[PDB]
Amino acid sequence: APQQINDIVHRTITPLIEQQKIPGMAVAVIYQGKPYYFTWGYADIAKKQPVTQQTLFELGSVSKTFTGVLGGDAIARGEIKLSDPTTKYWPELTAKQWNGITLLHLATYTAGGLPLQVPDEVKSSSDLLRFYQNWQPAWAPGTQRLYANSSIGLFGALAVKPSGLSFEQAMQTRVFQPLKLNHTWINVPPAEEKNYAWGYREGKAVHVSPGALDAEAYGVKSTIEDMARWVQSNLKPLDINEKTLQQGIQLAQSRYWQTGDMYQGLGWEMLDWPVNPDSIIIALAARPVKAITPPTPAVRASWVHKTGATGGFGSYVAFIPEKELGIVMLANKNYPNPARVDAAWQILNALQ
């Protein structure tokens, strides 16, 4: 690692860890396309296990980028179309409010106010159908954006139906395997538990709890090496040999809607680069959206990013395609989003 990268990373993260009381953290900087790794602290405080390049962290909502790319791949394969009605892949959804709601609306949180969380009471397949049938939109489709797990979560579930594979099998075979993310999991196998960090919430060790559409919305666990590979794949999709996956990655970084200075892709969110650091910057935030008709194909001069959290973890990924630059920050404490973005910007701005 060039001393320059070493210095900006350490000078930025050391203080972050101190100020936020983060138990353990891993960071990857992709510079001129090559990855440089950094780790600090503990994966498990009680057992004194250090964070290493093999430690698994819960990605939380950064998992939505995988769902958006898997969806992009199904589109490229001709299995689904974002313009299709939700009812085409779920005929049992007969309630009238669903008329006009398309897979694009689900994927981009513009269905009309689907809730941030699926209630804990919802578990079985019949429970889920009931939940969506009973939901009453606050708004017409494609008029307001409300970030929601029950929205992109349903998109992920429907998107894999034509394939005949479960969401986990589809993700493994169409995304993880092709990209060689061999230590990325929806369900952590027993063989890999020795590497699964504990998350910390109010000092207590915790792992994410099972929930409906958890795989689709916030259930991926990964290492800093595999996430660095994920960032490189998204920085240069053309190097990817699998044709539909290469295309899927590109579809996920297309700009479908605009709210303020930000653009909504599939999972990924983007802003034009150069970005005002404070512009990159609440339990529920409903914002009107302007449709980008037709969507803008992935713009190289973009700050592409996604924040993620679970009760015990906090993650952040951001990259700038035009500069072959990127960063992944994984931590086992859910600390403020502004602090993650401030650190990422400080590091990437210094190397750009």
From Swiss-Prot:
Annotated effect of mutating L284A: Reduces binding affinity of inhibitor compound 3 about 30-fold
Effect of N149 to D/H: Lowers activity more than 1000-fold
Residue positions binding a beta-lactam: S61, Q117, Y147, N149, A309, N334
Record's note on what induces expression: Can be induced by beta-lactams. Expression is not up-regulated by the non-beta-lactam inhibitor, benzo(b)thiophene-2-boronic acid (BZBTH2B).
Keyword line: Antibiotic resistance, Hydrolase, Periplasm, Signal
Gene Ontology biological process terms, A to Z: antibiotic catabolic process; response to antibiotic
Consequence of substituting K64R: Lowers activity more than 2000-fold
Xref: SUPFAM superfamilies: beta-lactamase/transpeptidase-like (SSF56601)
Gene Ontology annotations for the cellular component aspect, listed alphabetically: outer membrane-bounded periplasmic space
Top-rank lineage group of the source organism: Bacteria
Listed result of changing L116A: Reduces binding affinity of inhibitor compound 3 about 4-fold
Function: Class C beta-lactamase which confers resistance to penicillins and cephalosporins. Has benzylpenicillin- and cephaloridine-hydrolyzing activity. Has weak cefuroxime, cefotaxime, cefoxitin and oxacillin-hydrolyzing activities.
Subunit structure: Monomer.
UniProt xrefs under NCBIfam families: bla_class_C (NF033085), BlaEC (NF000185), CMY2-MIR-ACT-EC (NF012173)
Protein name, entry field: Beta-lactamase
